[PDB]
Amino acid sequence: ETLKPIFGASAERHDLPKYKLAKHALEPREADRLVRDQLLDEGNSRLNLATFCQTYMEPEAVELMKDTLEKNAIDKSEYPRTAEIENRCVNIIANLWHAPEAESFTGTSTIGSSEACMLAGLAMKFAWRKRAKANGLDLTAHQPNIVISAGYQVCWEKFCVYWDIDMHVVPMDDDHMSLNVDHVLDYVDDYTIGIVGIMGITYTGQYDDLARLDAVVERYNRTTKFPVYIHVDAASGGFYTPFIEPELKWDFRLNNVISINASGHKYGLVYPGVGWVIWRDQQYLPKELVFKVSYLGGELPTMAINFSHSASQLIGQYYNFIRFGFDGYREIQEKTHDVARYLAKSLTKLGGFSLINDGHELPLICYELTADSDREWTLYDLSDRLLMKGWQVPTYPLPKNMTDRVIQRIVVRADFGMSMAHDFIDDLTQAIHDLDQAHIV
Amino acid sequence: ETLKPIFGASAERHDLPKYKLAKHALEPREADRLVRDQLLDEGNSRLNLATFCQTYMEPEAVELMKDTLEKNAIDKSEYPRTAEIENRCVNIIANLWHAPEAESFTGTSTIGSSEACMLAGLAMKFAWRKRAKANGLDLTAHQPNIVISAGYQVCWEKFCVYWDIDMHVVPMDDDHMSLNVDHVLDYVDDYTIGIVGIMGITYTGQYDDLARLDAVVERYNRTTKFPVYIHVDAASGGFYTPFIEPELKWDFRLNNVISINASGHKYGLVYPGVGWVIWRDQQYLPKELVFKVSYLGGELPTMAINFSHSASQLIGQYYNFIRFGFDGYREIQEKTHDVARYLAKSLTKLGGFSLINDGHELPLICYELTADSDREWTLYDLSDRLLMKGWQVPTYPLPKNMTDRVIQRIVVRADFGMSMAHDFIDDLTQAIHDLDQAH
Amino acid sequence: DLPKYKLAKHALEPREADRLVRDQLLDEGNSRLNLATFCQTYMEPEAVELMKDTLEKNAIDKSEYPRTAEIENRCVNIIANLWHAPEAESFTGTSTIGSSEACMLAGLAMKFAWRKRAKANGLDLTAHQPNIVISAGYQVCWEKFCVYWDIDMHVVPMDDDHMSLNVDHVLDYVDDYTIGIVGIMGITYTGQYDDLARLDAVVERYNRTTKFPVYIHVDAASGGFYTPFIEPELKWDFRLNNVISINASGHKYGLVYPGVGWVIWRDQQYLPKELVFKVSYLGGELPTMAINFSHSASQLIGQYYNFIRFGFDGYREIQEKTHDVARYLAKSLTKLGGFSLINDGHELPLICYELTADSDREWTLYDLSDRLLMKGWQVPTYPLPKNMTDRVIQRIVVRADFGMSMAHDFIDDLTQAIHDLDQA
């Protein structure tokens, strides 16, 4: 049985189970080799330039994550030490976002910013509904709505479809590639549950002007009995911007920012599987959304869509916090910023590229092809050629009012080093040369 | 700085950050030691008997999970091999649950059964809503409802709160530690989006009689233009019952079971982080819950609440499928069954216990203390002593119409060996003795 | 950046140096998805760890590693017997780095043996160089042998009816100056076997009528560790009387990572004594034939590991599996249509093909290589050897670690690439 060579065994002579469980078990070495082999031919994650999600952690953190895979992040009474870590993380992030000590912030780890955005939105919906009932607003006339920029990530569309919320979408244009705050009051009405500000737009790399939105909202709220507050989607900005622009006011320093989310597995430096949501004060969380759990043979409040899941990633987040601290994070984000700027400068130096975003805010570059009548090929062709050399660079359309603009994004993470970025620009230069003399589509 | 002994260094003279980041970085070996040390003082997971969640996997699966932590399960176009493995697990699981060849099943991995239950309940709500509109029901008069046993896991209560559904709860009693199928139609009306049958109840370890419920539903549905269908919450049973009672009809063999969820991290044998939901046919999934993702420069359908997350657990699930196959899963679940039955027999031989559930169905044992005015201690005191001897055994009240009944539960998972269970019973014997003479 | 011209002045941290080298290595192909080479891209975990643990051993150093030397001699014995070295005669052999060095050493034995014959017969050595006769699908090492040692290459061209040595005409290239004929048991470009049994009979007839006889060297770089396990009845080896020496690459179908080959002589008389350098091991002195001096013993020890671990049945199971994958691929390409198979994997597990004539097809095999590379597979395009240099082919070489599940994935990738190309 183990006498069989791994690549002489019966299982290596047949296809893998695709529709049903095979009758018999296999040796651990055989199953292992077959599963790993199915995975060989997908992009090496380090060359995936299409994602915010982290593709490197230090070996110590990898080993640590491995050793805590059995831990169950929901089970506070059985894993009270993991639950303490989570609490420390929430405190740490709250302080990073200037949660005021005069109010009692609450928050939680989530699987990612999607779960967090949905919880935040649900908190807004439920708080809005109590206001609406008390002011005799007719709940059958219209659906509640939220106001958000057209750069929204798909989780906000899921939130709206799943919970019967209209989306009041503030479109982008050539000058407003972030929320047009000057016009935001045109989308607000009695049924508005809140306004989402995006601190790092997935499509463009740009910050919404949260400080200006906060000023407008402060003034709007004196004029109505249907006040409206800000949720910040800082999926990506939340772990980046405090270390490189600490004086930019986007967070709980703004009076009307009531909740904030971020993904640990974006610029929090953790592999996929953790996000974070924080409410400035226990009142911006309606009690009917809080399910209470056993802890210290007593009680703790929880806001959660998921139940059981791995604590590995939240532990990893604490490992990062302790390991890097403020200065370590800052050094990492600064080098990331620097590679993004080298890249934006390299693409203008090559010509044929017009930069939509040059990496001044998030470390992300967006560009389109400058129109040239003597070019058969599109960015789709460029993405194909770059795959030949390992690189994944996605091509996509901009969101509404710029759906005629086709772009490519490069997102730069902590493990995209300066040397690898010089290599990328070589590979990219050769691709442009190869496509300039191509004879097929 | 790298010369310092780990326990001679400045970071071990100071407390860890609790309220804010420290300013300065630490060396990797020091950070690693400090985080692991914070974790020493929780109960070794293998001795946690309150939970269905897996606390062991074989070393080859551990290493494969480690090696795949950077993969992002949502990102199909960048990890198409991982997405193909996912599709293969949906097929495998659909087949295991007898999805009919004549219809076209769909499904997806989830983080767990919570997200699965919620996506199923939402499919039911949206499909109910179209049917209700088309029959002119007044949608303003009552919230939609769902019907379920009182032993529902908290994720159904969350589903109901979050989506404004009324829960019509069928109570338990002394003779019905699972759904009272004969009474279920008292709870159904035109507003009912569906009935949830639980294939392995968290509190009691018992199967809802899904076959009987299907026959009740089939009869009810011929008399009405508001038909009702069954969603099976098989969080636990989905990966247990197919291997030990393959003939028990609970799954898509029943005509009116339109969807089923199971937790891969329960009897599917994966560490926490993977669940599964399957629909018997595409028509039971409303198109407006499907958000589309690029793949091979085309389009692929997804139902999902979460977005980015680890692929490690789902690859682990496929590893288990390949490594164990049907017979391996069967041998594991059989051993697990054997241990549960050993624990049930040892509690009865000790005297002083009444078995509420004896582990014939899920491998779970439920018990209360028999009436006795001379005994001054409670099951809460027993939990506390068992904890001193290393074990976590929860004490809790039974659900509706038994909320005055206090019980203990022991769940038996794959990694509770017979050896270890003999040791548990010695420990339980000693703790009883200790409680009988303390104050 | 990393040093590209000069040494840096200062050392780096281990983790930093490690990270920098490994990152530089990132962006080259996962080796296992390269279908253009015979070189092994996988070994079992015990072998990898044994290799790592004997990295320090020196294969050349016999008095200092006598147990490693014994292992070499065992492998030589094992390989001799596999290729049916006769017991009536006295075979010798050695490990080498690869088939190149082995080919070179065998070619040099032939040159030196020819030159003595030639002097004895009064042949004018100044009038022509010695020559060797070989098929036009020769591997580059034969051309380096000829250039390095001043031997003319008498090349037998290939054509549509002969994708291996043309035995009908091989003697047209043979003359008094011929040091030998090389028969290739697995041609790199085409995967085909030269008809060794026929060449042997032809040579036996030739040799009966001249005092300048010619013998056969078999370049079994690939076939040597493959053909004995799936076609043991095929006579290609020392069962043929005029086969005097044979080479094979252990890092080809011998299943070892790069860095071992083997050369065996059927008898001591085919190895001129001037090529033998003797050494100090155990009580006496051991004969050596070797171009290289110090080098790793890891691959050698890897080969013995493989022989002990798998034995006959294990090698056979691996090679039969490999055979089945190759056959699966040939049948999958015929199912798709549009390909003309030059080799269909009945001989070596290599499939070789061209696109069938079609005027309404805008794309070529070069474009197909490109789309496969996008999908992660290296399947390059190249011209055939002399007389078919205008014919453009693609090749898939199947090795031990190309399992059947992986091959179904490859075929789905290939199917999709074709579709994409037909809309381009």
Ligand SMILES: *Cc1c(COP(=O)(O)O)cnc(C)c1O
């Ligand atoms: C990616 C992203 C999300 C979703 O994040 P996950 O962590 O993948 O769930 C939400 N908002 C924004 C701005 C994002 O970039």
Ligand SMILES: *Cc1c(COP(=O)(O)O)cnc(C)c1O
């Ligand atoms: C635990 C459980 C759930 C929740 O499962 P997770 O996988 O933890 O989300 C749902 N239903 C039942 C019956 C359960 O036992």
Ligand SMILES: *Cc1c(COP(=O)(O)O)cnc(C)c1O
């Ligand atoms: C590759 C090859 C060689 C050279 O082999 P190495 O082991 O790389 O030195 C010689 N002959 C044939 C037939 C080959 O395929």
